[PDB]
Amino acid sequence: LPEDPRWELPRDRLVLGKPLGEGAGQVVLAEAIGLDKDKPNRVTKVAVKMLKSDATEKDLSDLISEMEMMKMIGKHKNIINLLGACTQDGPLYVIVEYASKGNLREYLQARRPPGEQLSSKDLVSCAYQVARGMEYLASKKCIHRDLAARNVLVTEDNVMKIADFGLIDYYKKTTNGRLPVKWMAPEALFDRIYTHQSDVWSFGVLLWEIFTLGGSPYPGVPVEELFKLLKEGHRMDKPSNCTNELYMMMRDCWHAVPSQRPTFKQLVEDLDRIVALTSNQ
Ligand SMILES: C[C@@H](Oc1ccc2[nH]nc(-c3ccc(N4CC5(C4)CN(S(C)(=O)=O)C5)nc3)c2c1)c1c(Cl)cncc1Cl
Structure with a gap:
């Protein structure tokens, strides 16, 4: 070399x-x-x-x-x-x-209440940083193609850092058994079209991941059934412990028409405003 x-x-x-x-x-x-x-x-x-x-x-x-x-x-x-x-x-x-504290999925799951504590602001703050990270990549014409909580890492100072941005079997599962197809935008999944807009869809799932403290999307749903739901235009339920505004954001991200989805630029501006208005208690 x-x-x-x-x-x-x-x-x-x-x-x-x-x-x-x-x-x-x-x-x-x-x-x-x-x-x-x-x-x-x-x-x-x-x-x-x-x-x-x-x-x-x-x-x-x-x-x-x-x-x-x-x-x-x-x-x-x-x-x-x-x-x-x-x-x-x-x-x-x-x-x-x-990144000392592992990926975001692990970080969130480790800080779930009993059955250390992340405030509502912390959760929104998490989404802001990830959006800010994707905006930069997007500004450098970088398309992630598998944006998910698993591919966000967290440092000792709780800084979100996006990973595997610089890198197909649909039925193949991740390390702890999740199907990446569940983060894919329809046009990517069907027509194999990947854009920044397709990353925004995936960011939509990442939001859902955040406010479920590392929840698993479409649990128990195989790939064939996933195609069914998407074709039917099905959308995941609003998580408990999540405002309507933030749910709308996810829904916007999951807009069927790619051009109608928000840009990360927009998502950064919105989350900026929301963080400042979200309480830490
Ligand atoms: C493939 C690997 O790739 C990378 C690439 C750059 C990195 N920088 N830093 C890491 C990293 C550092 C520490 C770390 N862990 C230590 C713990 C998670 C286990 N806990 S603990 C010690 O408190 O039980 C924190 N995981 C990943 C890292 C991993 C990776 C892993 Cl192992 C987990 N999730 C996403 C990915 Cl992409």
């Missing part, structure tokens, strides 16, 4: 830790010593993406393309930023920001 001095990190400055997630492409917790040359004695907790034992040549290509995509897209608070890479004299390591 060519070196790119801007981003390169010597391997002796990277102490690998425990695995965060696998694939069979995998991710590992690590510590970078002097991630920026200006601050060389600092240790930073990072996540390192790398190949697994039986990766293809095209798997490598994909990881490289992901790295280059991130360089193109640039920095933003509400995305997982590239920090560095090891491309020389050893396997490819792609160093990204570490």
Whole structure:
């Protein structure tokens, strides 16, 4: 691989830790010593993406393309930023920001009341940050294609960061058994058309995910039945503990006509206003 001095990190400055997630492409917790040359004695907790034992040549290509995509897209608070890479004299390591509190689905579920505590403002605030993150990506012509709570990460300071933005079997399930088709917009699901507007649909589900504290969409619904519901124009019920205004927002996001869905630009402005008017108690 060519070196790119801007981003390169010597391997002796990277102490690998425990695995965060696998694939069979995998991710590992690590510590970078002097991630920026200006601050060389600092240790930073990072996540390192790398190949697994039986990766293809095209798997490598994909990881490289992901790295280059991130360089193109640039920095933003509400995305997982590239920090560095090891491309020389050893396997490819792609160093990204570490998110201590896991993905948003896990974060929400872990903070459900008994049967630490997220206020109404916290929930709305969560949606704002995710919208702000998607607006940036969208402004950089980046289409996520699987925007969901599982692909939003949460830092030590409760900052929402969008993941796997720089990357089909419909019946394949996620790590804990959810079907990604349930986040897909109709035009994407049927006509295989992906736009920013299709991400807005998916953001609609993400909203629903938030105000159900990591609820599972369409529980017990297989793929064939999902097609049925969408063709019938069915829409998920308003969650309990969720205003009409926010439900309207989801419904707007789930507008059958893509052009009639709001832009993330609009969703950022609306959520800005709502956060400030939502109480923290
Ligand atoms: C595939 C992996 O990809 C990445 C890519 C960059 C990252 N930066 N930071 C992470 C990360 C860091 C910590 C972390 N966890 C530690 C905990 C969740 C488990 N709890 S705990 C220790 O309190 O029980 C927090 N999960 C993910 C991370 C994961 C991933 C995972 Cl494991 C979970 N959800 C989404 C995705 Cl995309």
